[PDB]
């Protein structure tokens, strides 16, 4: 997260870190055994780290739970990043508590200008890299489809939205992928991609979770 702020430990209790011996993506806990992340975060060897704040220190409240299923959307296209959503089933249910909590899925899509909280342990620099220890947060609005499509012509599918700040300086960034964009208490986005981070006129692009709620539910229900 570039231009964000330290969330505060466990203030984003649905935020998970996907760890493969290092944090590589975020995710969002959507029930005690399932995490939503980005399809492009798929890999083997995912350990979901819940309850994290400082991802480099065991502070307490962590739950590390291996992914037992990592379900990339069947129609994920790694070139276009359409359907950039993955469900991770935890090998065992997380113990939910105030610091490890699911986030609700949308019941409907969010509107342009809705303010959302985007969080993650991604790079905090728009140039170069600095990976934070603690979870960073960014309040960011959903942009209009027209602005999103203007920023990324031909690249924004119906399963994407832009959020953030065209003036630059505030965005999700590498390492935030897969993590949440929560708006009005609903997981409306998954950090997916963007041109750089926090670059002028290049807002973050996010998987539009509301398009996947049924798929999520159906996939969870069948797994």
């Amino acid at each position: 997260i570039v231009g964000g702020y330290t969330c505060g430990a466990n203030t984003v209790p649905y935020q998970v870190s996907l760890n493969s011996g290092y944090h590589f993506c975020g995710g969002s806990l959507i029930n005690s055994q399932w995490v939503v992340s980005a399809a492009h975060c798929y890999k083997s060897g995912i350990q979901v780290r819940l309850g994290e704040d400082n991802i480099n220190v065991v502070e307490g409240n962590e739950q590390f739970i291996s992914a037992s299923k990592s379900i990339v959307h069947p129609s994920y296209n790694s070139n276009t990043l359409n359907n950039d959503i993955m469900l991770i089933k935890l090998k065992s249910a997380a113990s939910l508590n105030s610091r490890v909590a699911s986030i609700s899925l949308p019941t409907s899509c969010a509107s342009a200008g809705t303010q959302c909280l985007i969080s993650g342990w991604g790079n905090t620099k728009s140039s170069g890299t600095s990976y934070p220890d603690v979870l960073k947060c960014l309040k960011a609005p959903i942009l209009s489809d027209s602005s999103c499509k203007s920023a990324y012509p031909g690249q924004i599918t119906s399963n994407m939205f832009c959020a953030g700040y065209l003036e630059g300086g505030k965005d999700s960034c590498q390492g935030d992928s897969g993590g949440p964009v929560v708006c009005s208490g609903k997981l409306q986005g998954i950090v997916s991609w963007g041109s750089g981070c926090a670059q002028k006129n290049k807002p973050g692009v996010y998987t539009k979770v509301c398009n996947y709620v049924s798929w999520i539910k159906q996939t969870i229900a069948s797994n």
Partner: peptide, 8 residues
């Protein structure tokens, strides 16, 4: 680029 570590 995707926002994973590493970006893709």
């Amino acid at each position: 680029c995707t926002k994973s570590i590493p970006p893709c």
